[PDB]
Amino acid sequence: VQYVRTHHQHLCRENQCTSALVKHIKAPLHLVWSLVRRFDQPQKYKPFVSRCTVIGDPEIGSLREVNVKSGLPATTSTERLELLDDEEHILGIKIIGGDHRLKNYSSILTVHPEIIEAGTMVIESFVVDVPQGNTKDETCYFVEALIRCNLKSLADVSERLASQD
Amino acid sequence: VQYVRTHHQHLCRENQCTSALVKHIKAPLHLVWSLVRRFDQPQKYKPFVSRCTVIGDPEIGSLREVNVKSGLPATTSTERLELLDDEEHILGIKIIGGDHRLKNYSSILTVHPEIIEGAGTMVIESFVVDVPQGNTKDETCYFVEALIRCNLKSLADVSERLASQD
Ligand SMILES: CC1=CC(=O)CC(C)(C)[C@@]1(O)/C=C/C(C)=C\C(=O)O
Ligand SMILES: CC1=CC(=O)CC(C)(C)[C@@]1(O)/C=C/C(C)=C\C(=O)O
Predict the structure, then answer these.
(1) Is B3's Cβ below 8 Å from some Cβ in A?
(2) Which domain CATH number covers B98?
(3) A139 lines ligand 1 (CB under 6 A)
């Protein structure tokens, strides 16, 4: 699309991979945005987050500590809010630490209005270091699986709330 | 495609999910098929297999025990050759055991000739698998799909590399 080139086509280092995922949601922008924007409450649509803690009211620079469910190669992740534009509908996160295999993970999510035939298009893209011993493809296929899980869930939650009002 | 309706559109139990993946490879069919069909040698293109054991010459009904690399929610898998048609280029596998979370995994893979830019081959692999208690259909299928993309991409890489050399 037009938007992929604007925010989502990333230049990454040799030891890195990058990808972008698109999701269409039969819900209005305001529902979808007010779910993704909530930095201290990803567990509301992210299926693998069991717990999330943020000290103070969230602002740019804030850290969150997220605990993930059993069955994953990770138990905790520490994440920083890099960008949050309520007017342009842009969210930037960088994972800065924790239990897991994702070093230098950086993320940008954008939300856009679309066609009922009101809908919403969510694009999330990332960059991440390839762990020693894995390939670019392996790393990016796995991370994409996580993101698909998130955006599909975000879709379901959003469309559920839309049907109620 | 029109092929996915023939071999790859599966009906599911409620507790199951199903999906199909396509890969185009810039290599001739003979190379791709030779790799895919070697039931006792999946580690030749499957990047997560560290070891494979098949007792006796592989026939229909044969079992393989695959050992898997560290870093996965699995160490071993035991798998059965359900179907191998060397003329139609069809392979069917069923995962019957191991210490992993894929109960009742069934797999079908077909290979088809294509015209590459100037030659090429299209690989379709689809599966059915139980949703583990506590996961959703989406989670289950998105994860298994990650594994299959890894395998088919590697298959593409190995195939095209071999095609370079003649
Ligand atoms: C579910 C999970 C699995 C891991 O192995 C790493 C980590 C714990 C960071 C993670 O929460 C990853 C989450 C990702 C990639 C995106 C997100 O949630 O926006
Ligand atoms: C790589 C891996 C990870 C697991 O969690 C289960 C298992 C060990 C079965 C597996 O080998 C799965 C392989 C799959 C789904 C298809 C294949 O390779 O044809």
Answers:
(1) no
(2) 3.30.530.20
(3) no
